[PDB]
Structure 1
């Protein structure tokens, strides 16, 4: 058959949850009718297939006390409005606060709703939001999670929880056979906020051999609050790092890069550590809270570093950039994990979840 599937998400900016949603929608939009309701006006950062319909909610003032109060009430009823007109067989909502809003807005409407979490359980820190997540999530029809630790946490107060890995859209484009002409390039792709911890990337570059810094180009793809602070630590440390802002063609960067470094403290299942697999990019990652070992088998598929260890990241960096035959062997083993993130297999596991919850 064919189903109307409505995705609900706050924004569609250069983030991981957004990348997965566009990947899923683009895959489902051929055989089903998929719409996307987003709170933020503006165009999707990721290329979206013409068949998926995107509707952005009204824009509301937030400058004054009356509007800060009124806009939220107006936002809720515009979302309840959009849900009714979508005429969907199923709703799929993304990320913590938007899941709760959909739980409430969907009250009354006769369509099942699937919520999905994307960071670890622990990334949501405020005491109050952890509570509203606890009382409201039992009222969903199913919950998609990324790791086994989050499955165990939510299963005790959510009845249907399914673990669905992130699908990588590069598994369609990039053929599993391609040779790469690597350059002396090292990537840090991610948001420039505290948890991504990009300062660890900078301090680790400063501790690299003078030969490596002189003959390698280090770039930071992404943006965030810490952008200007990092620009000044690059001068404080006296290194050469190329800030690129948000980048559409990460395929080009992944195509030339030899190493990608992830330095986060807490993560669910980082897509930069998945996308890298298709481009023979060597992953060096901090042992972020939880995931870690299921993406990187240390010294076999990649290199792991303790959390916030600027020197350990530097020694691992020199290991790979001073031993191309070892980085190649590290990276050829990583190719085995490509099958785990193929779009076609993961789309069919969402379709099982959708028809399973559609038995209401």
Structure 2
């Protein structure tokens, strides 16, 4: 048949949620009809299919104490307005702040709201939002949730929670079993904020053999608030890491690169650890909060280090990089996880969930 799907997100900037949304949208787009409603005006970082109808809420002023409070009622009713005027068969919204907003704004309309947590339940640190999520989330119609520990957490107070994986858009593009002629390149891809923890990457490149360190290229794709101080500490330790910062063509690095390191303290299902599956990139990652083992059979299809162990990382790095027959084995076992992220399969459960929610 057919449905109007409306996606509601804050921004469409170089993120992980926005990466999933567009993969789905681009895929549902062809059979169905897919509006996106995004708050912060601007363009999308990710090539968005042409049929995807995209509508941005207004720009609002947050100067003056008046406009500081007023622009929330104006935003809210501007949101309720767009939702009404989408006449969508279903609303799917993304991330806690946007999710709680949508639940309130949707109070009234007779259309289903899906909402999805896209990060471990413990990330939401403050006390008010952790509370508003507890009161408002049982009023949605379903709930997408990535890690199992989050389903066990959200099932306590939400009646319909589903575990949907993320869909890797590379799954259709990159043929399974492709020759990759790699280059001495280690990749760090991600936001340069405190949790993503890029400093541990630097500290660890410091501790590598001069042999390796002088023949390998190290690269930090991504930008954050740490992009300045990271460059300072790169001098303080004195290594050669090439900050590129928000590079829309990560496919180009993902090929040449041999290894990819993730250093974050807590995550849900990082797509950087999913995309590598498609490029014979070997993953090395901190045993981050909770969902670590769901993604990496340590020493079988990846390598896990203690959280924030600058040395542990370097050893594992030096381990793979002094050993091509190993790196090459790990990834051939990692190719095995590729299916668990094909958009084709992931899309149809989104479609399945939309159907049951559209009944009642």
Distance in 1 of aligned mates of 2:57 and 2:123: 27
Per-residue deviation, residues 241-272 of structure 1 (Å, max 9, x unmatched):
00001011000000100000000000000000
Per-residue deviation, residues 268-305 of structure 1 (Å, max 9, x unmatched):
00000000000000000000001111111000000000
Distance in 2 of aligned mates of 1:133 and 1:244: 36
Aligned to 2:253, the other structure's residue is in SS state helix
TM-score (norm 1): 0.99
TM-score (norm 2): 0.99
**Cα deviation, residue 69, structure 1:** 1.1
Per-residue deviation, residues 173-229 of structure 1 (Å, max 9, x unmatched):
000021011000000000111111110000000000111111111000111111101
Distance in 1 of aligned mates of 2:46 and 2:291: 25
Aligned to 1:301, the other structure's residue is in SS state coil
Distance in 1 of aligned mates of 2:293 and 2:240: 31
Q: Which runs of 5+ in 1 are unaligned?
A: none
Aligned to 2:359, the other structure's residue is in SS state coil
Aligned to 1:55, the other structure's residue is in SS state strand
Per-residue deviation, residues 9-34 of structure 1 (Å, max 9, x unmatched):
00011111110000000000000000
**Cα deviation, residue 70, structure 1:** 1.1
Distance in 2 of aligned mates of 1:147 and 1:70: 37
Aligned to 2:176, the other structure's residue is in SS state coil
Distance in 2 of aligned mates of 1:81 and 1:223: 34
Distance in 2 of aligned mates of 1:201 and 1:160: 39
Distance in 2 of aligned mates of 1:182 and 1:56: 41
Distance in 2 of aligned mates of 1:178 and 1:147: 30
Aligned to 1:7, the other structure's residue is in SS state strand
Distance in 2 of aligned mates of 1:83 and 1:174: 36
**Cα deviation, residue 134, structure 1:** 0.0
Per-residue deviation, residues 118-154 of structure 1 (Å, max 9, x unmatched):
0100000001110000000000000000011000000
2:30 corresponding residue in structure 1 = 30
| 1:66 has 2:66 as partner | yes
2:199 corresponding residue in structure 1 = 199
Aligned to 1:122, the other structure's residue is in SS state coil
2:317 corresponding residue in structure 1 = 317
Aligned to 2:242, the other structure's residue is in SS state strand
Distance in 2 of aligned mates of 1:69 and 1:123: 26
Distance in 2 of aligned mates of 1:146 and 1:173: 23
2:339 corresponding residue in structure 1 = 339
**Cα deviation, residue 72, structure 1:** 1.1
Aligned to 2:285, the other structure's residue is in SS state strand
Aligned to 2:30, the other structure's residue is in SS state coil
Distance in 1 of aligned mates of 2:333 and 2:84: 48
Task: Give the length in aligned residue pairs.
Answer: 360
Distance in 2 of aligned mates of 1:346 and 1:6: 18
Per-residue deviation, residues 58-106 of structure 1 (Å, max 9, x unmatched):
1011121111111111100110010011000000000011000000000
CA RMSD across the alignment: 0.5
Distance in 1 of aligned mates of 2:262 and 2:166: 17
Distance in 1 of aligned mates of 2:225 and 2:234: 16
Distance in 1 of aligned mates of 2:217 and 2:55: 40
Distance in 2 of aligned mates of 1:193 and 1:48: 26
Distance in 2 of aligned mates of 1:31 and 1:83: 21
